[PDB]
Amino acid sequence: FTTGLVYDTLMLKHQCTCGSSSSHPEHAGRIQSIWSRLQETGLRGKCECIRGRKATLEELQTVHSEAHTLLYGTNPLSVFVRLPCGGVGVDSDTIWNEVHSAGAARLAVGCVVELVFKVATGELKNGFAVVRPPGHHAEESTPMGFCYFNSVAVAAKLLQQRLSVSKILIVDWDVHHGNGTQQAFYSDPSVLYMSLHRYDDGNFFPGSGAPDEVGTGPGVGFNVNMAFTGGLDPPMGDAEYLAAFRTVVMPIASEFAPDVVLVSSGFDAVEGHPTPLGGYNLSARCFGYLTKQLMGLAGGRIVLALEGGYDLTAICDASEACVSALLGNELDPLPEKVLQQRPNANAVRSMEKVMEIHSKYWRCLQRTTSTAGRSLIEAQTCENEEA
Amino acid sequence: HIRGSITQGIPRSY
Ligand SMILES: [K+]
Ligand SMILES: [K+]
Ligand SMILES: [Zn+2]
Ligand SMILES: [Zn+2]
What angle, 0 to 180 degrees and rounded to 10, lies between the N-to-C axes of helices A29-40 and A312-326? 50
Q: What is the CATH number of the domain that holds A98?
A: 3.40.800.20
Q: From CA A177, how far away is CA A76, in angstroms rounded? A: 33
CB A34 within 8 A of CB A306: yes
Cα separation, A305 vs A323, in Å, equals 11
Domain region containing A319: 1-387
Distance from CA of B12 to the nearest CA of A (A): 6
Segment (H or E) for A44 = helix A43-46
- Identify all chain B residues contacting A25, using CB atoms and an 8 Å cutoff: 7
- The active-site residue, picked from A14, A27, A136, A137, is A137
- Chain A nearest CA to B2, separation (Å): 10
| Residues listed for chain A | 387
Facing residues of A144 across strands? Answer: A147
Residues of chain B with C-beta less than 8 angstroms from the C-beta of A276 = 7-9
Partners of A193 in beta bridges = A170, A223
User: Which secondary-structure segment (H or E) carries A354?
Assistant: helix A345-358
Q: What are the CA-CA distances from residue A43 to residues A49, A258, A271, A281, A321 (Å)? A: 11, 28, 23, 25, 10
Pick the residue of A81, A146, A205, A275 with the most B CBs within 10 A to test the interface with B by mutation: A205
Q: Is A137 annotated as catalytic?
A: yes
Q: How far is CA A141 from CA A66, A180, A246, in A?
A: 9, 10, 36
For A269, residues 6+ apart whose C-beta sits below 8 A from its C-beta are A173, A174, A175, A196, A198, A236, A241, A278, A280, A282
CB atoms under 10 Å from CB of A159, counted, come to: 21
Across the interface, whether the CB atoms of A93 and B7 are under 8 A apart is answered yes
The b-or-e profile of B1-14 (16+ CB within 10 A means b, else e) is: eeebbbbebbbbee
Specify the resolution in Å: 1.9
Using a CB-CB distance cutoff of 8 angstroms, which residues of chain B are in contact with residue A275? Answer: 9
Question: Position A270: which residue type?
Answer: V
Q: Is-cis flag, bond preceding A206, omega within 30? A: yes
A16 annotated among ligand-binding-site residues: yes
For residue A121, the SS3 value is: coil
Q: Which residue, A171, A14, A174, A189, is CA-closest to A103?
A: A14
E-strand ranges in A221-375 read 223-228, 260-265, 302-306
Q: Are A144 and B12 in contact (CB < 8 Å)?
A: yes
Give long-range contacts, CB 8 A cutoff, 24+ apart: A62-65: A62/A154, A62/A157, A62/A158, A62/A161, A63/A140, A63/A149, A63/A150, A63/A153, A63/A154, A63/A157, A63/A180, A63/A184, A64/A138, A64/A140, A64/A141, A64/A149, A64/A150, A65/A140, A65/A141
CA of B2 to the centre of ligand 3 (A): 21
How many H helices and E strands in chain B?
A: 0, 2
Query: From CA A308, how far away is CA A301, in angstroms rounded?
Result: 23
Distance (Å) of CA A266 to CA A18, A22, A134:
26, 20, 9
Instruction: Count interface pairs A-B at CB distance under 8 A.
Output: 42
Within chain A, strands assigned E span: 3-6, 48-50, 81-82, 88-89, 126-129, 168-172, 191-198, 223-228, 260-265, 302-306
B10–A92: do the CB atoms touch at under 8 Å?
Answer: no
End-to-end Cα spacing for chain B: 5
Report the distance separating Cα A223 and Cα A217, nearest Å. 12
Question: In the beta sheet, which residues pair with residue A194?
Answer: A171, A224
Task: For residue B9, give how far its alpha carbon lies from the nearest alpha carbon of chain A (Å).
Answer: 5
Q: Is A85 annotated as a binding residue?
A: yes
Sheet strands (E) in A51-111? 81-82, 88-89
Parallel/antiparallel/unpaired status of strands B3-5 and B10-13: antiparallel
A382 is in an annotated binding site: no
* Domain count within chain A: 1
CA angle A347, A352, A356 (to 5 degrees): 155
Counting ligands in written order, which one lies closest to the CA of residue A218? 2
Residue A321 DSSP SS3 = helix
